[PDB]
Amino acid sequence: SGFRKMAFPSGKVEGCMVQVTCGTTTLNGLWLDDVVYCPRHVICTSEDMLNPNYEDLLIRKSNHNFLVQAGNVQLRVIGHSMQNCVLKLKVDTANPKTPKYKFVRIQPGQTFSVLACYNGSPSGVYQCAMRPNFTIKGSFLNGSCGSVGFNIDYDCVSFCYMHHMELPTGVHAGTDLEGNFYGPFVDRQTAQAAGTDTTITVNVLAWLYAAVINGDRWFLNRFTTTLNDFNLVAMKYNYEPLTQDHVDILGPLSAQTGIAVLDMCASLKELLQNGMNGRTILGSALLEDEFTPFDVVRQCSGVT
Amino acid sequence: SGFRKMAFPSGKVEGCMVQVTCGTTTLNGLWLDDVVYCPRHVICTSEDMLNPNYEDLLIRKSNHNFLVQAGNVQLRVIGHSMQNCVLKLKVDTANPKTPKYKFVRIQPGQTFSVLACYNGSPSGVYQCAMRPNFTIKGSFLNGSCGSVGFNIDYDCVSFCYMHHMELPTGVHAGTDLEGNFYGPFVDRQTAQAAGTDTTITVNVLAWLYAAVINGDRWFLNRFTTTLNDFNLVAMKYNYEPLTQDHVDILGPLSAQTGIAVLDMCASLKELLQNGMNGRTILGSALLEDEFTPFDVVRQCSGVT
Numbered sequence: 001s002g003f004r005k006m007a008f009p010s011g012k013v014e015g016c017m018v019q020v021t022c023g024t025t026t027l028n029g030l031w032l033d034d035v036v037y038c039p040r041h042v043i044c045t046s047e048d049m050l051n052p053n054y055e056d057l058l059i060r061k062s063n064h065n066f067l068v069q070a071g072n073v074q075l076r077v078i079g080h081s082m083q084n085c086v087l088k089l090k091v092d093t094a095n096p097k098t099p100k101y102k103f104v105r106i107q108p109g110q111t112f113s114v115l116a117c118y119n120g121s122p123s124g125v126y127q128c129a130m131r132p133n134f135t136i137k138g139s140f141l142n143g144s145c146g147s148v149g150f151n152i153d154y155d156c157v158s159f160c161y162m163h164h165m166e167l168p169t170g171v172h173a174g175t176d177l178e179g180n181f182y183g184p185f186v187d188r189q190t191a192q193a194a195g196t197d198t199t200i201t202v203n204v205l206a207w208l209y210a211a212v213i214n215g216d217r218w219f220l221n222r223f224t225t226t227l228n229d230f231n232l233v234a235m236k237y238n239y240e241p242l243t244q245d246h247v248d249i250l251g252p253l254s255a256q257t258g259i260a261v262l263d264m265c266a267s268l269k270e271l272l273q274n275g276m277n278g279r280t281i282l283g284s285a286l287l288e289d290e291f292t293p294f295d296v297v298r299q300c301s302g303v304t
Numbered sequence: 305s306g307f308r309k310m311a312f313p314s315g316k317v318e319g320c321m322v323q324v325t326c327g328t329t330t331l332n333g334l335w336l337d338d339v340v341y342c343p344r345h346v347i348c349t350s351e352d353m354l355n356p357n358y359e360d361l362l363i364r365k366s367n368h369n370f371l372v373q374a375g376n377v378q379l380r381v382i383g384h385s386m387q388n389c390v391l392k393l394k395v396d397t398a399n400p401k402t403p404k405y406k407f408v409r410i411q412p413g414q415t416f417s418v419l420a421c422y423n424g425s426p427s428g429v430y431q432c433a434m435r436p437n438f439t440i441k442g443s444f445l446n447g448s449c450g451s452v453g454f455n456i457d458y459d460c461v462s463f464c465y466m467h468h469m470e471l472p473t474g475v476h477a478g479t480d481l482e483g484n485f486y487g488p489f490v491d492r493q494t495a496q497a498a499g500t501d502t503t504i505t506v507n508v509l510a511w512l513y514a515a516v517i518n519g520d521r522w523f524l525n526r527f528t529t530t531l532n533d534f535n536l537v538a539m540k541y542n543y544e545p546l547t548q549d550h551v552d553i554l555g556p557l558s559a560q561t562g563i564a565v566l567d568m569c570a571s572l573k574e575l576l577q578n579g580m581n582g583r584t585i586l587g588s589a590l591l592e593d594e595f596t597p598f599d600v601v602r603q604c605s606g607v608t
């Protein structure tokens with residue numbers, strides 16, 4: 001009973017957070033085995049950020065210029081390399097708390113937990129989604145760069161995001177753990193604008209299924225629709241178009257509730273056209289799109 | 305930049321979760337030092353829950369009837385006692401991962417993180433508030449009892465809640481770590497109704513301050529009000545009355561934004577009277593009341 005925006009338990013990731021300092025810049029790092037991963041802009045001053053040439057700035061750096069502190073103890077840096085927008089600092093000690101892990105590059109619409117950190121110390125955990133415009137709406141302050149996003153499958157942590165930037169609109173941008181940015185963003189203090197932040201239709205549908213499972217059923221209408229008809233409305237309301245791949249992943253939710261996917265589409269279509277009329281679904285006055293169909297299944301089934 | 309419903313990092317609490325089984329009933333336990341705390345109804349069958357006499361049911365139980373498993377290893381129970389609605393199982397091994405901790409009984413309106421668990425294993429973390437009617441709107445399924453709620457001050461975990469019950473309306477009820485229920489609820493499968501779930505006014509104001517700090521300023525009106533005038537409106541809209549104690553705790557937010565507390569009250573008064581008019585504040589189409597003034601300060605200042 002009940003439905004919450006829930007993050008993964010963060011312990012496995014807390015045990016990987018370190019502080020990385022290069023000169024006067026301090027950021028967060030992720031220590032997995034004998035490597036510390038961190039944003040490459042840890043080498044920049046505020047002035048360098050306006051127009052950095054990272055390869056050039058890296059020529060002036062040796063292993064001993066990167067200070068890595070795990071808890072209150074210093075790790076010895078024995079190698080360093082730049083991979084896309086991340087630096088990989090080889091340390092002489094494997095992290096004893098390294099969980100089983102993978103690096104995954106997620107698709108727009110996918111959710112993940114963020115462990116917001118400052119000075120290598122965790123401050124909080126929250127749930128995000130990779131927006132269709134490849135930004136995330138996080139909660140980050142100065143020194144948050146290097147905080148990571150992740151999903152957990154039983155005992156394996158799949159790291160999918162590292163925080164690198166804040167757009168002038170207050171939305172956030174970053175990379176996967178191979179240092180490749182999501183979307184067209186660059187790690188530079190230059191004004192970068194985001195594209196249309198459309199609604200993640202398959203996630204809204206999943207959340208409407210979660211609402212039906214938890215008793216909120218007022219919005220269920222007497223209609224059905226087709227994928228093409230639904231998508232004309234989705235396009236008009238800046239919703240992502242729904243594909244048969246999205247219908248497929250909603251199959252278990254359709255099976256549990258007995259509500260055909262296209263019937264839920266028609267109910268969503270009416271909600272877009274009529275609005276909520278001052279009503280709420282799962283305590284929300286708007287349609288929530290940061291629960292994937294897997295998140296709803298996980299939460300509604302009690303996966304640990 | 306950005307503002308999120310954020311939970312505390314849960315690692316310190318994950319290291320305390322154990323599974324407790326008594327006969328055929330399995331629930332979660334909290335292992336701190338050499339004691340495991342769990343709901344006393346771990347001794348009940350489904351039939352016992354309809355009308356339990358816990359002292360009587362406890363006469364038939366010895367130390368060896370409580371099976372406590374930490375990870376995949378069995379702890380030896382060397383004592384047991386009932387304190388209000390919790391059982392305390394003395395084990396022969398102190399939890400090596402016991403964080404610094406306290407047991408605190410929170411007041412209505414206070415928020416905390418819940419680490420939802422099943423079979424002693426964490427499934428997710430989310431942020432809750434103790435409602436003014438002493439229920440919480442959690443996300444709990446079968447076997448979730450024994451999951452705890454907590455706050456963290458630097459390195460000290462203040463445990464404030466243990467999950468014991470689900471009301472027939474799907475809202476939740478439980479105790480502090482001394483086993484005393486919040487509100488009038490009893491650990492019995494009998495229909496129990498909740499009182500009026502009013503809005504936590506001081507939390508809404510704190511969240512309006514967070515909105516102003518993050519750039520959402522459309523709702524700021526040209527009015528002021530008094531505590532008495534504001535409270536007439538608060539009472540009409542099922543909002544908690546605002547006291548000078550609440551104005552006091554909003555002082556730092558008032559100072560950071562230059563918006564007097566009573567001016568924010570007048571802006572809230574107009575929002576109650578006019579509604580949102582299809583607009584959102586911090587991505588919400590309703591007024592959020594599960595951020596305390598301390599949560600807003602913590603999040604907006606980056607406390608770790």
Ligand SMILES: *[C@]1(O)C(=O)N(Cc2ncon2)c2ccc(Br)cc21
Nearest residue numbers: 140141142143144145164165166305
């Ligand atoms: C990154 O180094 C960092 O910590 N921040 C601060 C921030 N505030 C909000 O989101 N991030 C940051 C901002 C901009 C850049 Br180009 C890098 C960083």
Ligand SMILES: *[C@]1(O)C(=O)N(Cc2ncon2)c2ccc(Br)cc21
Nearest residue numbers: 001444445446447448449468469470
């Ligand atoms: C408690 O033992 C438990 O795990 N549950 C299940 C539950 N589902 C949703 O919230 N809790 C429970 C329900 C009712 C009682 Br009286 C005790 C428990």
